Amino acid sequence: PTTTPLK
């Protein structure tokens, strides 16, 4: 699991 560029 990973986090995506929090816009």
Ligand SMILES: *[C@H]1O[C@H](CO)[C@H](O)[C@H](O)[C@H]1NC(C)=O
């Ligand atoms: C986050 O990065 C990891 C690294 O292996 C995976 O590619 C995962 O699928 C990524 N998550 C998203 C939402 O792209």
Ligand SMILES: *[C@H]1O[C@H](CO)[C@H](O)[C@H](O)[C@H]1NC(C)=O
């Ligand atoms: C996803 O967001 C989290 C929380 O800020 C971390 O910064 C993480 O390094 C991010 N993942 C990517 C691939 O930039």
Ligand SMILES: *[C@H]1O[C@H](CO)[C@H](O)[C@H](O)[C@H]1NC(C)=O
């Ligand atoms: C990153 O963006 C993806 C959509 O491509 C998802 O909304 C994911 O939940 C996001 N991650 C964060 C930490 O907001």
